[PDB]
């Protein structure tokens, strides 16, 4: 219920930087067992995989694994100007 959806905002924070990480499904099998707070099952295999898949995070490369490139960079008007939206046209 409310306990759900609030548990995914914590354990994924800093584990990214410590990740080439082989066997993309093992990456969960690693994450699945850790901190002794471990969750449950493979239901989490496709969870952090296909959720965090976008918005930077880790790149998708073949033979089932994850790369890292551009996330390291982000982790590091007078008269008329901008307004940068709407206005139709």
């Amino acid at each position: 219920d409310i306990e759900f959806i609030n548990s995914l905002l914590t354990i994924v924070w800093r584990f990214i930087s410590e990740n080439y990480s082989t066997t993309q499904e093992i990456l969960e099998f690693i994450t699945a067992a850790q901190v002794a707070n471990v969750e449950l099952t493979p239901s989490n295999i496709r969870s952090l995989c296909e959720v965090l898949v976008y918005d930077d995070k880790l790149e998708k490369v073949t033979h089932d694994c994850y790369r890292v490139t551009l996330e390291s960079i982000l982790q590091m008007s007078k008269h008329d100007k901008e307004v940068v939206y709407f206005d139709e046209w």
């Binding site: 959806i5 609030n6 995914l8 905002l9 296909e50 959720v51 976008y54």
Partner: peptide, 20 residues
């Protein structure tokens, strides 16, 4: 991108698989 991973689905699997 969530709409660009799979295609044409309802809010059922979207709410689950998106974020929070």
């Amino acid at each position: 991108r969530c709409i660009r991973d799979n295609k044409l689905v309802s809010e059922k699997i979207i709410n689950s698989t998106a974020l929070m």
